[PDB]
Amino acid sequence: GPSSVAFWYAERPPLAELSQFDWVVLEAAHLKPADVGYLKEQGSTPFAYLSVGEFDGDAAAIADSGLARGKSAVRNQAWNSQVMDLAAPSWRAHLLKRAAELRKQGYAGLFLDTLDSFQLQAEERREGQRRALASFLAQLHRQEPGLKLFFNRGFEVLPELPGVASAVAVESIHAGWDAAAGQYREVPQDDRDWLKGHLDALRAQGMPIVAIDYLPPERRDEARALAARLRSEGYVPFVSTPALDYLGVSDVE
């Protein structure tokens, strides 16, 4: 897996600086193929963001895209993000086409997000979504064996996908972002208690685990210490801001 990792989702990625991280996850809309090639020339492994469980867009955006039939009307839906039906052929086809385009652009892998958004569906629908997610990920991996798949969590599907994921990320281990309360908050103990069983399992199988923790820029000294703490606990960390628009820290200075 990675020795160091950065995530940058904003415009104008600082490519020279990002190139010194082993793995770099980017929003591909803000890069051109020459930029992706430059990162590889420098020795970095570039990954493109891909949201598997949700479509990011206004209602105008998802209608324009031809994906409307695939939208699930979940009760707790986050604004500007639509939970999609992982069994919908138009959604699955859309994602596979996107993967092919990102492959052609030179990405070495995909960072697969919203792998647990199906838990927002009605309880009795979740197992069917989980199975559709697992079959989608297997088909993605079969179609695109040249893309390393860097999962964001995925605990409900990982046991059925041996050999598919190259690493698993987790937001967050110690320092997190409470999107509701809009605050940097310590990850609550009960959140760490729930993660422990899943992370212990991945550790037992040698899976590289990336910790995505959140501290604001003014706390860069604390972010350095936290990166060291996370490495001593076996994680490959990136400590940054929730917008991922910041040259956060993965190792000590």
- As given in the structure block, the two tokens for residue 207 are 């899976």
Query: Are the C-beta atoms of residues 161 and 138 closer than 8 Å to each other?
Result: yes
174: which residues sit within 8 A by CB, 6+ positions away? Answer: 186, 187, 211, 213, 226, 229, 230
- As given in the structure block, the two tokens for residue 10 are 């904003």
Cα 245 to chain centroid, rounded: 15
Instruction: Report how far residue 173's alpha carbon sits from residue 211's, in angstroms, rounded to the nearest whole number.
Output: 6
CA proximity to 136, closest of 102, 166, 92, 97: 92
**Rounded to 5°, angle at Cα 43 from 41 and 44:** 105
Residue 126 three-state SS: helix
Residue with tokens 């629908």: 125
Instruction: Report how far residue 108's alpha carbon sits from residue 147's, in angstroms, rounded to the nearest whole number.
Output: 5
Query: Are the C-beta atoms of residues 138 and 164 closer than 8 Å to each other?
Result: yes
Q: Which residues of 185-196 are buried (b: 16+ CB within 10 A; e: fewer)?
A: eebeeeeeeebe
Q: Cα–Cα distances in Å, from 136 out to 55, 96, 101, 114, 218? A: 16, 9, 17, 13, 41
199: which residues sit within 8 A by CB, 6+ positions away? Answer: 170, 209
**Cβ-based burial of 237 (10 A; exposed 0-12, middle 13-18, buried ≥19):** buried
Header resolution in angstroms: 1.5
- As given in the structure block, the two tokens for residue 199 are 């992370």
Instruction: Report how far residue 110's alpha carbon sits from residue 148's, in angstroms, rounded to the nearest whole number.
Output: 6
17: which residues sit within 8 A by CB, 6+ positions away? Answer: 247
Domain ranges of the chain: 1-253
> What's the farthest any 2 CA atoms get from each other in the chain?
50
Alpha helices in the chain (DSSP H): 15-18, 33-41, 59-64, 89-104, 126-143, 189-204, 220-232
Query: Are the C-beta atoms of residues 107 and 28 closer than 8 Å to each other?
Result: yes
177: which residues sit within 8 A by CB, 6+ positions away? Answer: 171, 183, 184, 185, 214, 242
H or E segment to which residue 30 belongs: none
Instruction: Report how far residue 18's alpha carbon sits from residue 217's, in angstroms, rounded to the nearest whole number.
Output: 17
209: which residues sit within 8 A by CB, 6+ positions away? Answer: 167, 168, 169, 170, 199, 202, 203, 234, 235, 236
183: which residues sit within 8 A by CB, 6+ positions away? Answer: 177
Query: Are the C-beta atoms of residues 9 and 26 closer than 8 Å to each other?
Result: yes
